Design a protein around this ligand. Sequence first.
Ligand SMILES: Cc1cn([C@H]2C[C@H](O)[C@@H](COP(=O)(O)OP(=O)(O)OP(=O)(O)O)O2)c(=O)[nH]c1=O
Ligand SMILES: Nc1nc2c(ncn2[C@H]2C[C@H](O)[C@@H](COP(=O)(O)OP(=O)(O)O)O2)c(=O)[nH]1
Ligand SMILES: Nc1nc2c(ncn2[C@H]2C[C@H](O)[C@@H](COP(=O)(O)OP(=O)(O)O)O2)c(=O)[nH]1
Ligand SMILES: [Mg+2]
Ligand SMILES: [Mg+2]
Ligand SMILES: [Mn+2]
Ligand SMILES: [Mn+2]
Ligand SMILES: [Mn+2]
Ligand SMILES: [Mn+2]
Lengths: 683, 683, 289, 289
Amino acid sequence: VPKWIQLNNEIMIQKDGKFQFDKDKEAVHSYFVDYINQNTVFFHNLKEKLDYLVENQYYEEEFLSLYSFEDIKEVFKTAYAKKFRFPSFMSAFKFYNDYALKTNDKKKILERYEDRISIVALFFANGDTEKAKEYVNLMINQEYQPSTPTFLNAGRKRRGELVSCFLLEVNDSLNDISRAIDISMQLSKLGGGVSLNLSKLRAKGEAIKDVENATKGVVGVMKLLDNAFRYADQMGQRQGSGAAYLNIFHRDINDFLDTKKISADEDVRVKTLSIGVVIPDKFVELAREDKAAYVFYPHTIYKEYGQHMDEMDMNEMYDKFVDNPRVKKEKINPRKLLEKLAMLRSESGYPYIMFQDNVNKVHANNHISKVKFSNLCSEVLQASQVSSYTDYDEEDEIGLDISCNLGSLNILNVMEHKSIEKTVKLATDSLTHVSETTDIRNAPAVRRANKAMKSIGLGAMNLHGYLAQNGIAYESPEARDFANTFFMMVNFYSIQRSAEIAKEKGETFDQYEGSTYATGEYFDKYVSTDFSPKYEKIANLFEGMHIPTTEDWKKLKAFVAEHGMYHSYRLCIAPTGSISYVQSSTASVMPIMERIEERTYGNSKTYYPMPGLASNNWFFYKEAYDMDMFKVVDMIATIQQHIDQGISFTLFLKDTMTTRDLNRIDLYAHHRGIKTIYYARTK
Amino acid sequence: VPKWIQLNNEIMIQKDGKFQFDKDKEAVHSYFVDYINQNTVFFHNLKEKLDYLVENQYYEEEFLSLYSFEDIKEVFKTAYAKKFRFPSFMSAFKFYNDYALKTNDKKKILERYEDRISIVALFFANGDTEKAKEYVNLMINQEYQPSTPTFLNAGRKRRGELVSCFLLEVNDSLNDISRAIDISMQLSKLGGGVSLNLSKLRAKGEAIKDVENATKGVVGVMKLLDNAFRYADQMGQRQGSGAAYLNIFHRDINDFLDTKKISADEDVRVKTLSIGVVIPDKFVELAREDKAAYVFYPHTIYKEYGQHMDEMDMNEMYDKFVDNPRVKKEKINPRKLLEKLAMLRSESGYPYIMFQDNVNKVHANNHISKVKFSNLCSEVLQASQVSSYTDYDEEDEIGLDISCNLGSLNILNVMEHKSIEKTVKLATDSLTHVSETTDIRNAPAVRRANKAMKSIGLGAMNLHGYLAQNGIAYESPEARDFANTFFMMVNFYSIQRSAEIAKEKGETFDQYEGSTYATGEYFDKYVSTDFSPKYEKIANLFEGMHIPTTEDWKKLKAFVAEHGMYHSYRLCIAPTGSISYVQSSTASVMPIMERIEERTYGNSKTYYPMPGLASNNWFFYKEAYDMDMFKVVDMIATIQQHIDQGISFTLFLKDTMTTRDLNRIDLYAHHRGIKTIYYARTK
Amino acid sequence: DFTQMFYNQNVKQFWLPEEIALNGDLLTWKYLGKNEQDTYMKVLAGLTLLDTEQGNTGMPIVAEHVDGHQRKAVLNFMAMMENAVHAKSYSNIFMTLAPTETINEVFEWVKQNKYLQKKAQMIVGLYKAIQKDDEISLFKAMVASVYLESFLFYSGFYYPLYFYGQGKLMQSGEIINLILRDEAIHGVYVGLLAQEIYNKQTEEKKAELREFAIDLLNQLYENELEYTEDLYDQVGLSHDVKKFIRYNANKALMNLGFDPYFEEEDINPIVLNGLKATVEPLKDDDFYF
Amino acid sequence: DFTQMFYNQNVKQFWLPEEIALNGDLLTWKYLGKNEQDTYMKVLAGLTLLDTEQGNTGMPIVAEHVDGHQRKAVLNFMAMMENAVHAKSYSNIFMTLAPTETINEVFEWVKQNKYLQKKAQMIVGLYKAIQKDDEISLFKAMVASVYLESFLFYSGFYYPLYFYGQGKLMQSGEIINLILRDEAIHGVYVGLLAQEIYNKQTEEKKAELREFAIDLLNQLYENELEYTEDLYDQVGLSHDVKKFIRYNANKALMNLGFDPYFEEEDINPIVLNGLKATVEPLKDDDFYF
Ligand SMILES: Cc1cn([C@H]2C[C@H](O)[C@@H](COP(=O)(O)OP(=O)(O)OP(=O)(O)O)O2)c(=O)[nH]c1=O
Ligand SMILES: Nc1nc2c(ncn2[C@H]2C[C@H](O)[C@@H](COP(=O)(O)OP(=O)(O)O)O2)c(=O)[nH]1
Ligand SMILES: Nc1nc2c(ncn2[C@H]2C[C@H](O)[C@@H](COP(=O)(O)OP(=O)(O)O)O2)c(=O)[nH]1
Ligand SMILES: [Mg+2]
Ligand SMILES: [Mg+2]
Ligand SMILES: [Mn+2]
Ligand SMILES: [Mn+2]
Ligand SMILES: [Mn+2]
Ligand SMILES: [Mn+2]
């Protein structure tokens, strides 16, 4: 047995009635001095290291050529001057197993944490030495963490894309379905997760050029996409991950949901394709009144009205669709559909739930389009325009397919450094650079929307870690007060940085003038309502850091109206799965699942206590399954009001609660303004 | 039970020790008089019928506008002047159930046999009244039958394509694989069978741009294509049919064959994808000497030589591949692979066997490319060039994908009319017209090859019917003598008509100058060997008909050298499945499977004696299973020497036949020059 | 060629009465008229009584005389479903809808009923007439069994399916649909076992067995018409029930490999809404000719 | 007083071998000596034979003669388990671990093995001797059935349990434990029915029935000793298995209401170590907060 995992297993050996949490420091120390320093390739000087990495196709020469070697040396000194030490064995293990650069035979270790951070910072700065040092300080202090694609691939030659979330709109044609399959395979080949909207596709039993009952529905396209994602699996190390989204008023909604039933046949069930359901407020209203709802055939609506069903407002056109004889509709029970959704989430965790009117009542770019679906992680909520891929000889009408670069603030380290403003602005700059350097040459709509929208996603993590290490319960009103103030400040500084970038570059995102930022309606609750902490305990947490007031928000509103905004979307809170270990942080803004997390890697068993877990804060680290999901919904809705995109909201369910409890949680989330619900995790 | 169904069922009722074959005339008469004349929409004049058909979106106004109504009336007069009568109930039933035009609700009948033939002839002539009358005489005499797509769809507004066989090359790239899936779905949507060459795709466990062992091989593409064909199911009318071809020296050949095993896993098995194996002479030579053979990874060969493995001559390149250390291979047993092929054909009828060197030793367009694979029916053998489908922004390099137009001479009717020359030339003209009028907007390589090659397929049928009705056994040497003479004449007149068309249009097919037609090497066996019948009985069959001599072939060679050749390919003997009933003919050049065909339509069972079956010729209608497959191979090889493309050669096996017997049949077919083997049908 | 496939389909259809909660049927039961409640009770008792014969005698007697371990196992499984699942399910439906005294009276009535008794005793008579090592008598019993599974039950199934298709008595209708789905596969399976015997016979013996099957069908059919009028005239449904009987008679015949007897008819849409040769190596000289 | 609780226990214990994936045993099987694999195959084949006859003959025949629809439902369910579940599970194990030729050979070996034929002859003979309305012949067959359930299986069960207890062949072992769990309740149930008949007799008749039971046990025991030696001598375990079968013979006697016959002995401790979310409808008040 390895010495470091033997030391790491001494955490669970209870001495004097307490877990030996200090063993993890010894565990990581032994891990380093017995595996990492031994397996680390060391060069005489940094120049030899960089030459070796560039020559052997490990790094990219173009980005390293913008700095003189003295500047690169200064950046590396800045990284190593911090003398960063991993606080736990899991942090270092995850870094050196997932993100640290290794030789071509996966034998030795080329990059330390400081080397990777310095390379990412030099990639972000794009020739600026001082900006590179600022990025080094930001990441070595672990105030900001670039997403897994960016952190893993920044500055590497044989790399995937820095963006891993893509959203595709599929038009109701065979050419568009073929192009969707092709683009899905191309993006899965790049390593990204692809989400597809299947609402515009006509339902099963619709006509294909005046021959009736000819269309196979969305389930045939679902099978096509599932096999396309199985094919493009990148060695199978990380198999192709796709998501399909369907509006709840699509006729194929029941067959769409039946693809996830355990008793589904092999000719229907999809395995590699996650599913999400988009629910307008009309469906919730119909289920609330116990009235008879109707699902519609999309092609009939398109023929009758000239627009797709999901491109229309269901809360204003549902009655017109029902009364229209030329529209084909099927009678359903909305409460039965809700119960089926709850049962499917209990048994499989699917579908993802998107509350469409919750997304679009606060959506800033409804002039471009309404948000019709989310991503594979169920937190990207941006306007999309469907493309019209025509025959080979004809020109294609390229729409807007969503993609944003992810990045997380570490709430604990940002709050410790009293650096919300600087961290948010530097992270915004880094995400802007990642957006600018991304060029997808096989997804035309993704490329066009990346150039036009310039959307970024700046998330946060370690919310529960910060609260538990500060003696605040996750369900407590003080926690929601802190989240309100913190994320209002993050929104303020992200909007300020976007406006400053627009002023400097002299350009805004496409169709900015129609957005709510340009009209000033976005800032109504910010110029009217003060978001300063209401509790003295929370107010001391922000001591030494200026909290923008209503006057500051009015000044920012004037600044945005006079200079514009560079990013259509700025903030989205992703799950942040594996980078949470490296940053020694709790995953996303969701509460922790286990206080001490037990994992098996190969034939070795190791335990990961939550960051900062001890006996003085053991009960503040309440597990997500033991807490009220209504209070978690309250917390996420408090955070969501300052986030322009969505939040990956996992529901943590006990075995005792029925499908009625899951439905009640979903309805309370819809009532409280929750935009999306990610997973129904059951213990 | 219908009266005609009862009358047709009285054939099996044996009266005086003989079948009541005359009951089928009563059966068809009753069928007509009781159902067809009742359900046939009648109009006061032909003008009213034509106006109703064009205005109700049944016909195309474009081709009918090319004639004055007087010319169309005279064409219809010519069709009805023959007073054509269906000899059997099954002929009329098949026509009026598969090809006759019906109302949009499929309740009444708009088209009789004469109306369908007149419309097809008017479409063929393209404005020529005398040519239309000639086509009417050719088809109402049932000397020439256009293929099911052409016969069914010609002159129809809501029609599929007139071509149903397509052959696609798939390049070793994700872009090309996605484009292949798209084109396969587009062509299956049109109702055409699609054949895909998978030999260029790199095998399983190959490197993808420095990531070794990352390719799923040809089986992942096979699953993608199977799901693509299942989705593109011809508007839910007829199941989507596709074929995949792999070289026997491809590394994935065993995985390719395992997709057809009855015990195949659901993640390996393909359902709607037929498989064909391409076998060079090198494999047969290795199996003959029992030397252990090697299957090669195609990407290693492409990297080492810059050419695809299937683009190179395995006879000269096999030793170089084996001796090359940079070419990856694994040992196989060629005899074990042959036994596996025979076992698979016994169990499921798959794969098709294409003898690569038998095709290419007589191929007239080896300069353009070698023939690497066949179609879904194993008779189309043409040169193909793989397309390089690049990224979306870049320009694609369009190659040549095979698609030929099918037509069948009725050997019995052509022989009784003494009109081999006239029928062959008119059929060539009609196939040329179908080729010119075909434009496919989503298969650029198919369209380019149709425009450039101008290849057609003129088949033959009713060989066994003609022989049995003339007192000649199918396995007899006299039958092979007749086949030799008849198909030599067909080849002579097809070459003459092609050269005449080239002279008239002043253009040949693309890259004709490199063909064996241009150099005269094609005509060597025709200017050196006499193909007149060697039997007095056979020579009497051709009485009143000039059999081309050696001097005639020399004159044709001079004419082709002077004026060129319009069609790269002219003759291919397709199975001719359903059009054989309408023509009262035995299917293709194959012998009959059963003397009397027992089939069930709806809830009523039907009986179909072979055309011309009686007491006097009962034993000349020997069933195919009772025949010696070596003699059938001899017959097909006699025909194959005059057919530039292949022949759909079905093996008819008894249950007592072993794997060794099937292998012996395959090896004798290879020895005798058979190009392709279609099916292993076991009784 | 078929027993392992039927084994799979049978065991994967396994279910238990407890899975369907029955109490919510009282919310539609209370709104039916007396004639509707009376017909339902009588139909239900008819099905119960016939299914008991199949569980106690029909399936076990066939399992006893059929040779083959795998066939005996499938037949045992089917007998289990009759006795352990179906019988408990019918009892549960009754106990939910009627008080104890009403159940006892309905069973007394149906037990004395001329048309129910005629068919029940005709079927049981053929089961009792099976003789050891006599495949002809076994075949006759199999025909009787197929007629019960695929035909005689359906004059009864009609009514629960009729309600089920209208949104009435949905819980008991779900149970009946599961039962019916089991009887369908039972009928198909026993049908294949009967065809196996039939195919071993001479042409004269076959013609004689066909005459037996058609004659038996005729006797049962004429009694079904009387049974149908007796139960369904009071609720006005007999015409449509008769179409359903003939349609299911045709299915039973097809299960026995026989042609349909009755012309094709459309069914009530409410009821519809409710409803390796030999591997040999190449030994050289096969490559030379 | 007991049938309903046995009915509920039997149906709640329902299982299929396909629920257990067997490919996990592939390596621990590969690692056994040829002697060990031979004994293991033969042991399970002997079990397969017993379950074949218990399912085809024993349980159905006892079901036929026992009065009461609920008692018959339990016995029918037990019969189904014997041949549709238990006997089949052994083939699942064989098909995973062994090549077809070894499987063919072991089934040929059961046909010619004299101890296995003798025990089948004796047990099945008693089943087929049951006379309608003759409670004594029925009692004798129930004693035979208890001896099959609670005694005869155990010379076979020893070896899978012996491996399970060492952490070897644990997937196959899981199947065997499920089979054993079933047989334990089958032996108790049939034992209670046998006691019912015994308790109706005069003291003189009871004395004769005890003689029958003890004579039969001794005769089966002596045969089982020879069978045990024949199978286990090559793996060195015969004496240990003999202690186990004596232990279980006492349990069989106890299931019949008789005193233990063999003295207690220490059994191998290895062998001792070898031993959706609820759907709730949404209320109207659930939509307001
Ligand atoms: C061709 C084809 C289409 N479809 C479905 C998927 C598409 O969403 C939908 C549109 O097909 P299209 O490619 O648009 O077919 P079309 O343009 O000829 O028909 P239309 O005039 O009605 O637009 O039909 C199938 O389900 N199966 C098929 O084989
Ligand atoms: N020597 C050396 N330095 C490395 C390596 N990887 C990262 N570094 C960092 C450590 C220092 O902060 C910085 C400069 O190291 P150096 O080139 O040895 O310079 P110096 O120590 O002579 O000033 O580079 C490495 O492999 N070797
Ligand atoms: N009248 C009529 N003729 C039809 C129809 N379908 C095909 N025909 C053919 C029959 C004749 O050969 C030809 C001309 O028919 P017509 O218009 O009645 O001609 P005419 O005999 O009055 O000059 O058209 C049809 O529906 N009606
Ligand atoms: Mg379209
Ligand atoms: Mg490539
Ligand atoms: Mn039943
Ligand atoms: Mn039944
Ligand atoms: Mn058992
Ligand atoms: Mn038992």
